[PDB]
Design a protein around this ligand. Structure first.
Ligand SMILES: OC[C@H]1O[C@@](CO)(O[C@H]2O[C@H](CO)[C@@H](O)[C@H](O)[C@H]2O)[C@@H](O)[C@@H]1O
Ligand SMILES: OC[C@H]1O[C@@](CO)(O[C@H]2O[C@H](CO)[C@@H](O)[C@H](O)[C@H]2O)[C@@H](O)[C@@H]1O
Lengths: 383, 383
């Protein structure tokens, strides 16, 4: 599907949330342990500054925990206030810090729930985080929220909300300067959602706009992703001849800049396209390179998918290797890839008048669509 | 698809919107006009009183316009205020009322936009409405909002958000006493959403729960819909025999209460099931009754869908009448019906080992899936 992509650490945010839970309970050894463990981790990482802003605040909240406990040392246990009453006091006198921590807590707890594929739960925490945006005074930090809500709702395919949030983030980024990289990213969010709605031309316009902006910013990871995504739009519309140039330009960018993570996917559709077109000559060359990149990075999913291309276009087809591939994708919950591929096989046969085979794979497409793919649980509701 | 609702016109709420436009324009003849005419459309209404409440606050707003304009007939052009100024005076003195008016205004404007298939715009207005909820007094009216949001996002297939709003509505209705009908309707919402997610067991559980409660409230319209929908779930899963008693029970309920407008749908899938089973005698039975109900209710769509059952299972298939039927659904934008039926045709030919023709209708499905069925437009975003 579309190149998005990359950089979760739902791990760390949720660790800071747990640290906060230990802080509110005055679980001192546990709070000290996490205070140390998380620092070490965040130290090997110019990645989110999300996490960094949050860490600082909890650092300060940890120190206030210790300040409020210092008096208790000059006290008989019977004189000392209950810890629940100590906590009520901290929160009273730091209404503002409390609400900003409550913002991040829900935010990162939602991100974690999302990684756990607990969607309704994730939305619940995301809405509670949105309620605490009043505690987020900085406008760019508000826009970051909206931006990551757009990504999140893109992953959940709540297309309309993903675009509404991208438009909220856009409004803010646009009125500052060089938030231009975030702005072009808003463009790819519009584009990727347009694509899911089958609005290919509008997706292409936003991908082109985003490309132009990435070139001006000299952001080659982004230049290549948008190039790739425009070829994808063309490919989905069976406009094979227009797809190829974008796929080639995307490959060149990634390579010239040594972007290894992106290269197995960058090589994949272009390889499929040549098999489809009967240009076996040029297919085998693309198949080998992308095959070689997948080996280097140990891309399990792309190794398996390049092997699929040989099972269909070269090897019979090997219906047996195809079924096991489908079981593999299914077991990995790669349901979109699976449906597309099951169509590819149906279409392969259809075009060769093996209507009985085409048809069995069209029935397989149906069997995948009937699977619970993004299922949900009600929180505390009794039937 | 799943039965639900009753409606609506999305027209009276928009008329009160228009009414308030002239109020803010101080255009008294036009204000006066709609005040009378909306008054007259309301008292002849099976009212959800969104509207009446909205009307009443607007009637007061209309008098505050006639009242603010009193001192004006005592003045000549030069003495009198700018009507821009007069409006800001009225807004600043009536903070609470004005916000409560914005609540309703945005809510009914979003409904109208949804009705115009302007989805992102409908969400933009719905969020404005949600944000004036602070001006909304009472918790049952908050619950009404959430419940209606859940209905709207169900219609927009933003399934997770639809379930999140149903849950928020549920929580309020649950702690209240005489809101059992609302509560069972929340269960139908979880159920219809679970269905879209392929969680059939969860959907049945919640449909069964809402049936149970609808029985207790002696609410036959609800009893029939929930029974039909359980049948629908069995039908979706190809559990055809299991489906029949459910549809029979539903039809018994709709007939007992002369629920004429539900009978065409009620009869539809049970007819199709009998064809599917090769029970042409029973099939011909349900088909004549379902078709007669469609003729009497003036149901244009079912009249045409019963015709298609003839075309497919009796007439050849009559491929040509099937093509004109598909075009008809496509033109009315009935895409879910269209895809299901195209699959029904594929499977019928498949079972008869006409794999070429099966394979051609499997390709129709894929074409229908490629249409822009829910396209969107960005508000004011360049290139
Ligand atoms: O590579 C991980 C990362 O890439 C994305 C696109 O940005 O998905 C691609 O790679 C997957 C294999 O890991 C493919 O299955 C998929 O078809 C392709 O789009 C992201 O979805 C993923 O996080
Ligand atoms: O009666 C219109 C109303 O019924 C619903 C289900 O509650 O849809 C049914 O009727 C449609 C044709 O009018 C069918 O195409 C559809 O398959 C069927 O569920 C509502 O969706 C619709 O607004």
């Amino acid at each position: 599907g579309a190149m998005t992509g990359v950089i979760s650490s739902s791990s760390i945010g949720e660790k800071i949330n747990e640290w906060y839970m230990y802080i509110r309970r005055f679980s001192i050894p546990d709070a000290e342990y996490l205070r140390r463990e998380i620092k070490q981790e965040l130290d090997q990482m110019e990645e989110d500054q999300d996490l960094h802003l949050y860490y600082s605040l909890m650092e300060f909240r940890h120190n206030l925990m210790l300040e409020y406990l210092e008096p208790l040392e000059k006290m008989r246990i019977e004189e000392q206030p209950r810890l629940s009453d100590l906590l009520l006091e901290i929160d009273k006198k730091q209404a503002r810090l409390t609400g900003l921590l409550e913002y991040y807590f829900n935010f990162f707890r939602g991100m974690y729930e999302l990684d756990q594929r607990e969607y309704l739960s994730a939305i619940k925490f995301f809405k509670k985080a949105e309620s605490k945006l009043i505690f987020v005074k900085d406008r760019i930090e508000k826009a970051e929220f909206f931006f990551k809500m757009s990504e999140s709702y893109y992953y959940m395919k709540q297309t309309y909300f993903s675009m509404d949030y991208a438009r909220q983030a856009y409004e803010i980024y646009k009125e500052h300067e060089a938030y231009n990289i975030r702005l072009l990213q808003c463009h790819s969010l519009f584009a990727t959602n347009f694509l899911d709605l089958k609005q290919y031309e509008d997706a292409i316009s936003h991908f082109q706009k985003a490309y132009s902006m990435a070139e001006a910013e000299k952001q080659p990871q982004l230049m290549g992703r948008t190039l790739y995504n425009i070829g994808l739009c063309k490919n989905s519309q069976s406009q094979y001849e227009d797809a190829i140039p974008y796929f080639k330009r995307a490959i060149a960018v990634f390579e010239e800049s040594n972007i290894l993570p992106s290269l197995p996917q960058a090589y994949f559709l272009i390889t499929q396209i040549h098999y489809k077109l009967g240009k076996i000559d040029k297919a085998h060359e693309y198949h080998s390179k992308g095959m070689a990149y997948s080996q280097k990075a140990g891309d399990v999913i792309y190794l398996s998918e390049f092997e699929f291309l040989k099972s269909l276009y070269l090897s019979g087809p090997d219906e047996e290797a195809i079924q096991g591939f489908f079981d593999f994708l299914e077991s990995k919950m790669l349901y979109a890839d699976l449906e597309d591929f099951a169509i590819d096989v149906a279409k392969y046969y259809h075009e060769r008048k093996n209507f009985q085979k085409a048809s069995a794979y069209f029935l397989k497409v149906e069997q995948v669509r009937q699977l619970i793919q993004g299922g949900v649980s009600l929180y505390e509701i009794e039937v």
